[PDB]
């Protein structure tokens, strides 16, 4: 198969700690504001060994395409220039992002019918829960 338990269109159901997460990420007040207006739909899709996550909103349409284990450059939603590496372990996708000597983790896994994304920075954890569209 491949990475097939993540594939689909996902819609945000509940967010918690995300603004505080971005405070720890070092994101400025104005950007934190815009970032918390948007409640994007996450759209996942896999071709061969390349996975794609498309956060698609009115304000911003981002899209990362990654080979898995291979380092790629990313511009994050909040306007960071990052180097990311994505790993699959224990049924979970672990994305690490590094920039200006800093590192954060975005772990995406299934619970049951839902997909949970946790972002972690210096012991602030954000938790967003998506369900299927």
């Amino acid at each position: 198969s491949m990475c097939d338990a993540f594939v689909g269109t996902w819609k945000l159901v509940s967010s918690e700690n995300f603004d505080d997460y971005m405070k720890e990420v070092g994101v400025g007040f104005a950007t934190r504001k815009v970032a918390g207006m948007a409640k994007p739909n996450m759209i996942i899709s896999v071709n061969g060994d390349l996975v794609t996550i498309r956060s698609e909103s009115t304000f911003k349409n981002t899209e990362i395409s990654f080979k898995l284990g291979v380092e790629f450059d990313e511009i994050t939603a909040d306007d960071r220039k990052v180097k990311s590496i994505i790993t699959l372990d224990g049924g979970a996708l672990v994305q690490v992002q590094k920039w200006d000597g800093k590192s954060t983790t975005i772990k995406r896994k299934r619970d049951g019918d839902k997909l949970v994304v946790e972002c972690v920075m210096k012991g602030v954890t954000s938790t967003r829960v998506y369900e299927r569209a």
Partner: antibody
Amino acid sequence: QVQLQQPGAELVKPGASVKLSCKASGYTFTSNWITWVKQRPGQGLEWIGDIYPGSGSTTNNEKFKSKATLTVDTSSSTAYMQLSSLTSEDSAVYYCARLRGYYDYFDFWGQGTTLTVSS
Amino acid sequence: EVVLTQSPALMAASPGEKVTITCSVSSSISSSNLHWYQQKSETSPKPWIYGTSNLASGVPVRFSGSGSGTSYSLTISSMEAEDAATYYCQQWSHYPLTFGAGTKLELKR
């Protein structure tokens, strides 16, 4: 290139109102916050507000609540700040600037518009 | 409100000389949201250093920026005549957005 255009100078009588412009170009307009800064002669820099073109949502200084009101027209690619109930205290240079996301610093600035309120 | 206090309000330096301004904060900010601008002759101020230490496009290499918790600073390694100007730090980690009052840098003679 990235550029915000403001008229050079404006003359308005006391008690009247005035609406100032910041015309943008060289980048996608709705992707960046636009801020307004007031500077009087001799004195330093004063922040009025931010507006997000594309949403029109604002962040504002509590010191300028009555005075200033921020809006945009995306069709024109313009930002506007309206001042009202004008006094001599409003004679200053007004800078609009494009804000740069994460970090949130002002990378591009319009020349000021020198507002003069006088009889 | 995060109050930014900038030390020497007024400063004179002769070409060649090392120069340090401080921007000192009343409470904690994220180093990524502390910025310096340089203004000449009250025309449009210019971005100089962003995120404490980054340094804007076309800003010379003699300039650098530093920071830590209580204080941030701007340093010129060697003064040039064109560096005489008024330099404001500014903060956007927390509402409201604040400025410091500036330090004017004049040429010493």
